[PDB]
Design a protein around this ligand. Sequence first.
Ligand SMILES: [Zn+2]
Length: 341
Amino acid sequence: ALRHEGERLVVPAESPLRRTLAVAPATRETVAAPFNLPAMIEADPAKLVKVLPPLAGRIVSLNKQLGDEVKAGDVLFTIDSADLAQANSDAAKARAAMTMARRNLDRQRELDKSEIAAKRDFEQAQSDYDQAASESQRADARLAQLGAKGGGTLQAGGGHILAVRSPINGRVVDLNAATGAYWNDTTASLMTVADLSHVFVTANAQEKDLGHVYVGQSATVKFDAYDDPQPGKVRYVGQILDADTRTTKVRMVFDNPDGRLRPGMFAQATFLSQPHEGIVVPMSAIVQSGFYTRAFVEVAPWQFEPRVIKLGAQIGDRMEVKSGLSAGDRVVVKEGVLLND
Ligand SMILES: [Zn+2]
């Protein structure tokens, strides 16, 4: 009665599970798991651009339209920033005032001096100037900031109207802007240009099936709502998990000549791992407590040690233990030498 503890678990020599416990060495065998991954269609990250405006302002026009063809670099929309209007003139004011305010000062130094001095008014002269200068210096920077943002899309004259161009060839794939509407946000994004002649079919894999993927495979992709499955080859790859989901991206590029392949659609895939010599236990041997997962190994007769393992592929009741658990260990089957009940 019935499990004593060191950390490692000793069974008397007395106890009932002395009948019901069972063990076998851990056998290395060949594995060639077929495995299956959820996937989604994805535009080629660019290849696709959500075009944003460089500055806010009234939309003057929408050349190009949902479905319309585009070439790099057509004009897609035009913005009347104002905004940039103000700031251009304000800084015209700002400077005028200064320059004038200045030479009003300069003509008050020369009459203190030369001949005979007049009145304190020099005092206003200076305060007035110092101020107009600071304010101009202010306007100067507002223009500076703004023009740096919308300088590359300006035309000569106009109203200070920006013309945003498309940087790549494709079709207008999303719209969501109105002529006359003011656009305040950014990104925001007035439209979306894209060339989906080819798409990514991006499947996502788990640590379970991560040693089982390789650039080079060898995939069968079955969408919905398309009955007829379709072949692919993975181009990428791995190689870091996603923290939230703990999956990694495994993507294959598809031709989309029709293109019944639409970014967003769902699919599955459908792979075969290279044969490799792997170690495998029955389900009866694995136990989970949290985010783990471990088997029990006999030491020492009737003395067991926990062992943190991971894990998969499985199917059916056989389970690939990818570490470990190494060849020969007397693993239990099993079972609840982890509760005392
Ligand atoms: Zn494996």
